[PDB]
Design an enzyme around this catalytic site. Sequence first.
Site, mmCIF file in Angstrom:
data_model
loop_
_atom_site.group_PDB
_atom_site.id
_atom_site.type_symbol
_atom_site.label_atom_id
_atom_site.label_comp_id
_atom_site.label_asym_id
_atom_site.label_seq_id
_atom_site.Cartn_x
_atom_site.Cartn_y
_atom_site.Cartn_z
ATOM 1 N N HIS A 30 54.544 43.965 45.847
ATOM 2 C CA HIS A 30 55.434 44.760 44.996
ATOM 3 C C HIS A 30 54.863 46.122 44.671
ATOM 4 C CE1 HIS A 30 58.631 41.770 43.490
ATOM 5 N NE2 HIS A 30 58.202 41.419 44.687
ATOM 6 N N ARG A 58 52.162 38.420 45.730
ATOM 7 C CA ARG A 58 53.387 39.056 45.255
ATOM 8 C C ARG A 58 53.093 40.401 44.574
ATOM 9 N NH1 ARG A 58 56.771 37.732 40.066
ATOM 10 N NH2 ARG A 58 58.578 39.096 40.443
ATOM 11 N N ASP A 90 65.723 34.943 53.293
ATOM 12 C CA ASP A 90 65.028 34.096 54.273
ATOM 13 C C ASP A 90 66.007 33.636 55.359
ATOM 14 O OD1 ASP A 90 62.504 34.038 52.724
ATOM 15 O OD2 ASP A 90 63.506 32.551 51.460
ATOM 16 N N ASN A 104 53.347 22.538 50.861
ATOM 17 C CA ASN A 104 51.944 22.857 50.598
ATOM 18 C C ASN A 104 51.812 24.324 50.163
ATOM 19 O OD1 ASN A 104 52.651 23.759 53.180
ATOM 20 N ND2 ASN A 104 50.692 23.176 54.128
ATOM 21 N N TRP A 129 58.764 27.268 48.721
ATOM 22 C CA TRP A 129 59.353 27.273 50.047
ATOM 23 C C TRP A 129 58.803 26.147 50.916
ATOM 24 C CZ3 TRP A 129 58.522 31.602 47.179
ATOM 25 C CH2 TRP A 129 59.545 32.565 47.138
ATOM 26 N N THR A 130 57.588 25.697 50.606
ATOM 27 C CA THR A 130 56.899 24.719 51.447
ATOM 28 C C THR A 130 56.353 23.545 50.636
ATOM 29 O OG1 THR A 130 54.696 25.795 51.353
ATOM 30 C CG2 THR A 130 56.234 26.558 53.077
ATOM 31 N N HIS A 178 55.907 33.954 52.007
ATOM 32 C CA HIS A 178 56.529 32.898 51.207
ATOM 33 C C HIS A 178 56.039 31.501 51.555
ATOM 34 C CE1 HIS A 178 60.047 35.763 50.045
ATOM 35 N NE2 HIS A 178 58.946 35.978 49.342
HETATM 36 C C1 HEM Z 1 61.422 40.027 52.761
HETATM 37 C C2 HEM Z 1 61.854 40.442 51.558
HETATM 38 C C3 HEM Z 1 61.423 39.679 50.293
HETATM 39 C C4 HEM Z 1 62.206 39.192 49.329
HETATM 40 C C5 HEM Z 1 63.740 39.282 49.247
HETATM 41 C C6 HEM Z 1 61.358 38.530 48.366
HETATM 42 C C7 HEM Z 1 61.767 37.897 47.225
HETATM 43 C C8 HEM Z 1 61.012 37.071 46.430
HETATM 44 C C9 HEM Z 1 61.473 36.357 45.260
HETATM 45 C C10 HEM Z 1 62.912 36.406 44.694
HETATM 46 C C11 HEM Z 1 60.432 35.667 44.777
HETATM 47 C C12 HEM Z 1 60.392 34.743 43.549
HETATM 48 C C13 HEM Z 1 59.819 35.450 42.326
HETATM 49 C C14 HEM Z 1 59.812 34.465 41.183
HETATM 50 O O1 HEM Z 1 60.914 34.035 40.744
HETATM 51 O O2 HEM Z 1 58.712 34.095 40.693
HETATM 52 C C15 HEM Z 1 59.295 35.923 45.626
HETATM 53 C C16 HEM Z 1 58.041 35.383 45.475
HETATM 54 C C17 HEM Z 1 56.954 35.584 46.283
HETATM 55 N N1 HEM Z 1 56.870 36.545 47.281
HETATM 56 FE FE1 HEM Z 1 58.463 37.599 48.023
HETATM 57 N N2 HEM Z 1 60.056 38.636 48.778
HETATM 58 C C18 HEM Z 1 60.058 39.350 49.948
HETATM 59 C C19 HEM Z 1 58.935 39.713 50.629
HETATM 60 C C20 HEM Z 1 57.645 39.324 50.382
HETATM 61 C C21 HEM Z 1 56.459 39.835 51.030
HETATM 62 C C22 HEM Z 1 56.460 40.973 52.070
HETATM 63 C C23 HEM Z 1 55.414 39.157 50.543
HETATM 64 C C24 HEM Z 1 53.924 39.292 50.899
HETATM 65 C C25 HEM Z 1 53.542 39.295 52.181
HETATM 66 C C26 HEM Z 1 55.915 38.206 49.589
HETATM 67 C C27 HEM Z 1 55.179 37.301 48.882
HETATM 68 C C28 HEM Z 1 55.621 36.481 47.880
HETATM 69 C C29 HEM Z 1 54.871 35.409 47.293
HETATM 70 C C30 HEM Z 1 53.467 34.958 47.660
HETATM 71 C C31 HEM Z 1 55.738 34.817 46.229
HETATM 72 C C32 HEM Z 1 55.388 33.634 45.317
HETATM 73 C C33 HEM Z 1 54.995 34.162 43.945
HETATM 74 C C34 HEM Z 1 54.529 33.061 43.024
HETATM 75 O O3 HEM Z 1 54.258 31.922 43.482
HETATM 76 O O4 HEM Z 1 54.420 33.353 41.810
HETATM 77 N N3 HEM Z 1 57.275 38.342 49.503
HETATM 78 N N4 HEM Z 1 59.678 36.778 46.622
HETATM 79 NA NA NA Z 2 52.432 26.530 53.025
#
Ligand code: HEM
Ligand code: NA
EC number: 1.11.1.11
Length: 249
Positions: free
Chosen positions: A42, A38, A208, A182, A179-180, A163
């Site tokens: 970002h 993340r 999503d 695992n 989301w999953t 995700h």
């Molecule tokens: C497609 C548009 C995207 C949206 C709208 C989005 C939105 C979000 C939101 C709302 C969260 C939750 C944050 C929280 O409350 O802790 C999140 C988490 C996360 N995002 Fe995205 N995201 C996007 C794209 C991406 C991309 C491009 C990646 C990397 C390839 C990514 C990787 C992650 C990961 C790994 C988490 C989990 C973070 C954690 O476990 O602390 N996301 N995302």
């Molecule tokens: Na998974």
Amino acid sequence: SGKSYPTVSADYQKAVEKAKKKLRGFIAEKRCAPLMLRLAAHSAGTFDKGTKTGGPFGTIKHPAELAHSANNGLDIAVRLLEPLKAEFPILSYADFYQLAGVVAVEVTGGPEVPFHPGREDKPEPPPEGRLPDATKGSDHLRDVFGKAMGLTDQDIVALSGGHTIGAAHKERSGFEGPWTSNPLIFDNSYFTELLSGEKEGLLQLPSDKALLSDPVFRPLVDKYAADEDAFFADYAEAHQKLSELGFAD
Ligand code: HEM
Ligand code: NA
């Protein structure tokens, strides 16, 4: 494609290789791969191709950028990495954070995303408001990833698969849970779950769900759910591109 990577010294290259190893051990031990992915997304996702501003240039660690609403919780990620970063003073923060994102994918069992060093840390964070909004749909995704970042529709779907690891937190975005089933394993389960419907205990953002109803995005979701190898190939391509926005052309 379109990239001319800069020369860095042998000592810089040495430091990249050692930092990669140290990041593997650290990220695995702390269980923070999703947070690091993340962070990397970002940092990179603020790139605007028309103005050549933002992107993965170390500005995310600035208190001003960490304060952006979309970045809630990323201060944790920056703090976690600081002691390790200090062991590699030669590396740019920009390179270190993108390397951490690459490592996050690898340690959770994902594809090996190619990494090229040489990003220079930039002095000024981009304006707030460039990162994607989880409550919006396909038009918005194309505005952010396509019109601003310069990525393809294929990249949008593959990157949404990030995700597959991690979770939302009600105190960060407001959304909650993984989301999953695992969430520390990098696999195609994000897409399998998206297709199967709303299973209790699992999260789907409106952003999503937007993938399921779009004419271009849906065939890609179908492909990745059916073929994890195809997902891994497209994911590695897209992550490399994301990590290199505004860098080396
Ligand atoms: C497609 C548009 C995207 C949206 C709208 C989005 C939105 C979000 C939101 C709302 C969260 C939750 C944050 C929280 O409350 O802790 C999140 C988490 C996360 N995002 Fe995205 N995201 C996007 C794209 C991406 C991309 C491009 C990646 C990397 C390839 C990514 C990787 C992650 C990961 C790994 C988490 C989990 C973070 C954690 O476990 O602390 N996301 N995302
Ligand atoms: Na998974």
